[PDB]
Ligand binder design. Structure first.
Ligand SMILES: Nc1nc2c(ncn2[C@@H]2O[C@H](COP(=O)(O)CP(=O)(O)OP(=O)(O)O)[C@@H](O)[C@H]2O)c(=O)[nH]1
Ligand SMILES: Nc1nc2c(ncn2[C@@H]2O[C@H](COP(=O)(O)CP(=O)(O)OP(=O)(O)O)[C@@H](O)[C@H]2O)c(=O)[nH]1
Ligand SMILES: Nc1nc2c(ncn2[C@@H]2O[C@H](COP(=O)(O)OP(=O)(O)OP(=O)(O)O)[C@@H](O)[C@H]2O)c(=O)[nH]1
Ligand SMILES: Nc1nc2c(ncn2[C@@H]2O[C@H](COP(=O)(O)OP(=O)(O)OP(=O)(O)O)[C@@H](O)[C@H]2O)c(=O)[nH]1
Ligand SMILES: [Mg+2]
Ligand SMILES: [Mg+2]
Ligand SMILES: [Mg+2]
Ligand SMILES: [Mg+2]
Lengths: 430, 427, 46, 427, 430, 46
């Protein structure tokens, strides 16, 4: 039971999914060919005799990142109907991902999702992976969200997204895609996690002292986050957390479902020896402003509810001690209407280390998912960039040329404005 | 013969009940396979109070194991003494309430409650002279709190003249586990006020504090806490299970500790509790048991008895003991502390003596105290709820399964009424 | 605040009414049960 | 000497009969070859009731094997205990009915039925004093329903003062594997109402439910379903076959279970039925046998006894045990559940107790109940028939073999009349 | 006993028969020369000492396919006078195969069928294989239908046919032959199955991932269907479905006897490893419009009867579960006058895999034969083609030139119109 | 609807008449049939 289906959309989603499934195969002992020489039933379906297939679907309108999987070392893990390719890439266009190209490939992926969810008996939700700025990862992700909402309904919809960085982004039309996809994210998603590329970059530069990190480290860190999310469900612990439990304890209002996932401890091999890593200090490091994996300032916001997902040799003793010490600190301050704002989960399974990775093995690991008002200012600057581009009507003709109007841009902008007002009015004292 | 039906709800309730069955099968000499291997006939003289006879000289507990996810059932079964339970008593769903009192009380817990009622009906009809039920659960969760509260309501509808026992662990501000603790705590205390015959206010904070300073235990896991709660349960039921020089079953404690029907929230306690280092430096006698059980440190609630007035006190002793010694100790406690006991009730302390001590201890006692100090345990929950309720926080979840804010409002009206009752009887 | 407590009393009355209606509906036909005998006490000359 | 002639019609009837002869030969200690190898003399004392003395201490069943496909005859012969049967008794056609009641009752059953009457004649005068016949068939098909029904009519014409038990498997709304089940079921019921003394409404879906939830059987094949039916219809005649503290032959159950001639459709049951896991966690006493018997979930009909009133029930108990416990249990069932029992028949239960239990169980029980719930098992068939009959669906087949729509109308009218009678006596 | 005679008419019939007899020789272990290095009596008659002769007749007015059989691998299987051969083909002309060229060979095929039928004692029916488009497979098959009806009468006649597609069609004069042969198939056939080449190509290209499928793959699939249908006669199982049982359960009204065949699973060797092939998923796949063996949408129609033929490792438990799930789905519509609409047969013999075939070895197999109203629209488009060509009287002179009147075209048109009216009448609710 | 039930009664009557005619025809000569003796009961002074 307790199944959860992973959906990977776009290049970012597909690569993060490749890292995630590498990590899961290492976790459960599955070789890349799909063999085991129980608890793996969460993500892997047992077929026939000793053959495990992951409960995943990989979709991209271009076939390069999927043909890498079809010819890579994990080519025998999936079967071809879990790896769906289009003809023309969305080409960083929300319009192409949502209306023109997304329409002839949505039916097949929804059929695959239906066939996958029929096999599961205890489906807990969906883990959807995408990027805001990507045309596929915005448009087709939004289309798949609305189809899943009208199809499955009450099933939990958890998604991970790569929120564009304040200074760094590889696309010129990035804010358009971000606003366009978030206008439907606000209602078709139950809990959306954002991970910023600049934050992973400088976390790798400082904590892991990697001078030249690529997207491989990005996806490995994101895979560690998702593994810590699902560890309370793929193993056993003194304190278990389920996905619906996670939503209930983390989402205070229907429109406030955008928590910040931070992970600790991230250290190289050489710095692990000199540190006697206790639960208290990694818990403190989770609240440290430079360890947040979104480039924002928690000091300038208020924490609303944070979920603490411990794994390894962790006991409730020092967890409670660390939480009390965090409470006694005035730099980290919570909202007045949430006297208890800590959701706690302890798992006995330690985080596995993938060969070739830069993360050193640790007895204890923490993945705090804090819902805070400090993320409003990131969307504030995103709105500023959107307004700067939209005043001159730049790049709008590209979206209009294939079935979109200015009205959708205006309504998405005012929807984000209402969201900003919502964070402002929930962060205020009573 | 005065048998007790045991029910476990939620993960915490299931684990506490599992440790309770561990310690009580150790007490009654039942091996993990369920076959009697004791030495005294007193272990089988009253075995029917908890265990049902099975063909082949095999004993099965009268326990119903209830949860909304199969994980806790699998963990209970795979553990030690997990094979003793009857498989059909494992009534489990497939989703889990997800820390939602609504999902445990109305939507998905109520779908599963019919099977639980059927199994408890089997257990109550199979036995000859039932007296009451025991339910073990939490108050901060959705499965335990909400679904066990629905279960208590159903049982009281079906068995209004049988006593109701509930060993409830309540949230505390220090060890705060979830974000929706006050909602579930208030919604559960609401119906526990009128549905339970007597409730024990256990909390994880006081148990941790015991393990720190009294037991000197460096890294106490949840097993030690469940062991303390199990020892309390066994000490409460020992008068039924074992003989003594003065017997007092649960009805005697109910009539001697509930002066008014809404005042049945108790602070449990167990004596002796020792560290391994200090075992050989302490004399083992009734006066030091009495001083330990009456210490504000030995309480199992976030409630200082010095801040309130003891209405009634129950001390269920276990061992070969003088009666003059115990009675003089009660006089000394009630006279040196005349300001800490309520004044319109003479003889605030009831005494029960069982002659069979726990395994490995030649003498033990259990402290149950009906005090006005429960008022601040309720007030902290009430003020946390209020802080979360002006701003309408997390109510969209609970309203999603079909409640209304008026239900919450009447819940805090009931809790504030209970607090006012305790305060006005404190004077 | 008086209106709120009046509405509270009305809500409690409605809940009690529907609970009593459900109890009356249930009590018409009890559920099938089976147990041991509970023999009657013998009568003695008195 | 209180002789029973067994007839099997259709594949379902033949397989259920094969398992019946398996369990019967196991009880009386008859090996696969057909010779006695038991240990108790009671196995041979009443061996005649189902067998015939062959030459050389060999026993051959008094069974008639009827089908329109030779494949089932070959399958029965090739199976275990298949060699004990007399090759003469195998009466088979060559074409097959093809789920056509009309064919098996009028066209190709007409010339195959004469041979079956010849064989059942020879068996009838081969015995000392017979009491009746035992036909096993299913209602969904055409060979089973039509063949066995015409056979029943012919037998009752020839032997009108003898009992006639039909362990007829009826179709179910969930487990429906042929499209013309309503037609065959209605047509066969039309004459089962008027041409037999006891009909045991076995259905497949309740057997699947037993195997799923009671037996906890992962993959129940037809072997297990036929095993259940065989155990029940062996326990029906155990009083004939074995000594007991309270005997009851087929005619006595027919008297005590049929207040009015048209109400002889009984809902059978068995006890104990345990999973392998819960085998050692269950006491084997008369009260728990009664608990399992009267559980509406243990029935082998597509009926809920809670939806109607029991007219009469039969408990053919088996094993060494006390009459006091058995009869007080039956009394207690009648007392606390007076709403579920008919009021103008005091002592709705009839009790029989036998000494020799089924192999492997120290005591067992067979439940037989004449309840008004059968009305809705017939209503579902009636409404499916009415849906299929307004549009003349699939009727060109049945009309093709000389049958007319008037027979369908009279069959529907008769079934509606029986449903009305059951509703009338339910009140 | 329980013998059934297979009649193959025309090129399509002869080639499908070659595939069928190769499959059946593989099934019972018969070598291509007719030797075993019981249960074969349904299709093979044991002659002399260790020699098996198929109970088949191969008739074609053209010699080419029959002499291809006469010199192929299975030349020793058939004795020559079963393989019947004319001089000139019907040349896609119904008139040639019915009146002029078919009339000089009809006596020989009838007495060969007589010599083949009196040999067996339990003749169950005839399995006639032909195609609607071809002149032989229409005219001569029709003529053989009247002859069998007047001679054998009550004996069952199961007819396999290839139906022209909306697009895939290799004959210009195809609709004329299709209408003319159905005008007699309506009354001289008991249950005429339907297969469309375009749908089989579509299934092969999506499921069996064959880019370039030929007629041999098509006939392999059709032969698998026929083997699944006759497995109950040829083997033993939990539930056995006879031919008369099949007709009684699938044909509600005398003229509505045109069920849609389908098969599942149809997957390649590389596909079967990853997929978990349970009873529920193949049962769902039989109702998938993508897997229909004929190009028509079952959604636009409503089902009237289904004959689920299971073979392999199948238990009635999950068969009932799958049928209940199908009942719960709202997309699969069933008529109100059929509250129970699933005839079910479970067989123990798994489907044998032809060496060199495209199908994969599977534990379970289903051949679902559904009598649906979706075939009315395919008949309607064929009728539109027919009357479009008829308004201009094109190609009519070819038919009139060799013994055919103008009135028969109009009467066949009226017969097809009446058939459509009947389907519409049985579709409406009550 | 009364016409249908009258026709049903007529059909039942015709079927019963045919069945009775068949029974009368069969009863004229019973089938050849053989069993055991079934000895007569002894008579006693009374
Ligand atoms: N004394 C103990 N406290 C426990 C134990 N397990 C959990 N808990 C505490 O109880 C609270 C968690 O409640 P539960 O896990 O019982 C929640 P439940 O399963 O009933 O609801 P869902 O999780 O929403 O299904 C939290 O304060 C934990 O620290 C235990 O074994 N002993
Ligand atoms: N409980 C059981 N039901 C069975 C068994 N075999 C068949 N059946 C049920 O019987 C029903 C169909 O009746 P049969 O298979 O006996 C058909 P019959 O041979 O009587 O007529 P035709 O085969 O149509 O000539 C259908 O519901 C099957 O599920 C069995 O072993 N056990
Ligand atoms: N963290 C992380 N981000 C990635 C990775 N790959 C791509 N991205 C992000 O994805 C954004 C662009 O979207 P893509 O995923 O590359 O493309 P897409 O989703 O297929 O949409 P299209 O641009 O239309 O093709 C970039 O701004 C990157 O920040 C990756 O491996 N790791
Ligand atoms: N599926 C399938 N269809 C075939 C095959 N061979 C021929 N056909 C179909 O048969 C139709 C034409 O009829 P044919 O069988 O080729 O010719 P015929 O039946 O011998 O009649 P004549 O053309 O007069 O000789 C074409 O439309 C094809 O679709 C085959 O091997 N497989
Ligand atoms: Mg891309
Ligand atoms: Mg829980
Ligand atoms: Mg049959
Ligand atoms: Mg040709």
């Amino acid at each position: 039971m307790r199944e959860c289906i992973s959906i990977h959309v776009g290049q970012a989603g597909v690569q993060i999914g490749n890292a995630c499934w590498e990590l899961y195969c290492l976790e459960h002992g599955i070789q890349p060919d799909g063999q085991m020489p129980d608890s793996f039933n969460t993500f892997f379906s047992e077929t026939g005799a000793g053959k495990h297939v992951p409960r995943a679907v990989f979709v991209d309108l271009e076939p390069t990142v999927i043909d890498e999987v079809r010819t890579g070392t994990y080519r025998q893990l999936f079967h071809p109907e879990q790896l769906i390719t289009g003809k023309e890439d969305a080409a960083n266009n929300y319009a192409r991902g949502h209306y023109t190209i997304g329409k002839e490939i949505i039916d097949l992926v929804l059929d695959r999702i239906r066939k996958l969810a029929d096999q599961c008996t205890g489906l807990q939700g969906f883990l959807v992976f995408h990027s805001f700025g990507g045309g596929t990862g915005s448009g087709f992700t939004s289309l798949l969200m609305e189809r899943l909402s009208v199809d499955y309904g009450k099933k939990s919809k958890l998604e991970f997204s790569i929120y564009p960085a304040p200074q760094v982004s590889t696309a010129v039309v990035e804010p358009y895609n971000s606003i366009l996809t978030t206008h439907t994210t606000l209602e078709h998603s139950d809990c959306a996690f954002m991970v910023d590329n600049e934050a992973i970059y400088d976390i790798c530069r400082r904590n892991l002292d990697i001078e030249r990190p690529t997207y491989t480290n990005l996806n490995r860190l994101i895979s560690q986050i998702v593994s810590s999310i699902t560890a309370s469900l793929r193993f056993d612990g003194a304190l278990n957390v389920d996905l619906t439990e996670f939503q209930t304890n983390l989402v205070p209002y229907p429109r406030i479902h955008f928590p910040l996932a931070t992970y600790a401890p991230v250290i190289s091999a050489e710095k692990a020896y000199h540190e006697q890593l206790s639960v208290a200090e990694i818990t403190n490091a989770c609240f440290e402003p430079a360890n947040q994996m979104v480039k924002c300032d928690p000091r300038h916001g208020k924490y609303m509810a944070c979920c603490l997902l411990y794994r390894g040799d962790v006991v409730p003793k020092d967890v409670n001690a660390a939480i009390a010490t965090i409470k006694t600190k005035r730099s980290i301050q919570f909202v007045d209407w949430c006297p208890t704002g800590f959701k706690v989960g302890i798992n006995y399974q330690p985080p596995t280390v993938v060969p070739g990775g830069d993360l050193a093995k640790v007895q204890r690991a923490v993945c705090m998912l804090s819902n805070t008002t400090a993320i409003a200012e990131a969307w504030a600057r995103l709105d500023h960039k959107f307004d700067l581009m939209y005043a001159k009507r730049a790049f709008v003709h590209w979206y209009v040329g294939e079935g979109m109007e200015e009205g959708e841009f205006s309504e998405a902008r005012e929807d984000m404005a209402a969201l900003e007002k919502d964070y402002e009015e929930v962060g205020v004292d009573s | 013969m005065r048998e007790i039906v045991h029910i476990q709800a939620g993960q915490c309730g299931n684990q506490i009940g599992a440790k309770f069955w561990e310690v009580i099968s150790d007490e009654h000499g039942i091996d993990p396979t369920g076959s009697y291997h004791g030495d005294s006939d007193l272990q089988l003289e009253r075995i029917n109070v908890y265990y049902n006879e099975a063909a082949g000289n095999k004993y099965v507990p009268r326990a119903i194991l209830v949860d909304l996810e199969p994980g806790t059932m699998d963990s209970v079964r795979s553990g030690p003494f997990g094979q003793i339970f009857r498989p059909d008593n494992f009534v489990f769903g497939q989703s889990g309430a997800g820390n939602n009192w609504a999902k445990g009380h109305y939507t998905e817990g109520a779908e599963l409650v019919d099977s639980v009622l059927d199994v408890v009906r089997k257990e109550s009809e199979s036995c000859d002279c039932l007296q009451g039920f025991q339910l073990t659960h939490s108050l901060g969760g959705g499965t335990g709190s909400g679904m066990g509260t629905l279960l208590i309501s159903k049982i009281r509808e079906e068995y209004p003249d049988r006593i109701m026992n509930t060993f409830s662990v309540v949230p505390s501000p220090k060890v705060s586990d979830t974000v929706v603790e006050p909602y579930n705590a208030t919604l559960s205390v609401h119906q526990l006020v009128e549905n339970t015959d007597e409730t024990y206010c256990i909390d994880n904070e006081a148990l941790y504090d015991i393990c720190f300073r009294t037991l000197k235990l460096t890294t106490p896991t949840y097993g030690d806490l469940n062991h303390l709660v199990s020892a309390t349960m066994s000490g409460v039921t020992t008068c039924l299970r074992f003989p003594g020089q003065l017997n007092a079953d649960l009805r005697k404690l109910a009539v001697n500790m509930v002066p008014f029907p809404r005042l049945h929230f108790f602070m449990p306690g167990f004596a002796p509790l020792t560290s391994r280092g200090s075992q050989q430096y302490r004399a083992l006698t009734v006066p030091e048991l009495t001083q330990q059980m009456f210490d504000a440190k030995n309480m199992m609630a976030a409630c200082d008895p010095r801040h309130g007035r003891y209405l009634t006190v129950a001390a269920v002793f276990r061992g070969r003991m003088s009666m003059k010694e115990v009675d003089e100790q009660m006089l000394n406690v009630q006279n040196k502390n005349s300001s800490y006991f309520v004044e319109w009730i003479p003889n605030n302390v009831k005494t029960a003596v069982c002659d069979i001590p726990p395994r490995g201890l030649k003498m033990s006692a259990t402290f149950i105290g009906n005090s006005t100090a429960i008022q601040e345990l309720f007030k902290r929950i009430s003020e946390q709820f209020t802080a979360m309720f002006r701003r309408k926080a997390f109510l969209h979840w609970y309203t999603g399964e079909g409640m209304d804010e008026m239900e919450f409002t009447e819940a805090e009206s009931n809790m504030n009424d209970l607090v006012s009752e305790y305060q006005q009887y404190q004077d | 605040g008086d209106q709120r407590k009046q509405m509270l009393q009305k809500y409690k009355e409605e809940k009690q009414l529907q609970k009593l209606k459900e109890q009356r509906e249930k009590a018409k036909r009890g559920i099938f049960k089976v147990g041991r005998y509970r023999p009657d006490m013998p009568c003695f000359l008195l």
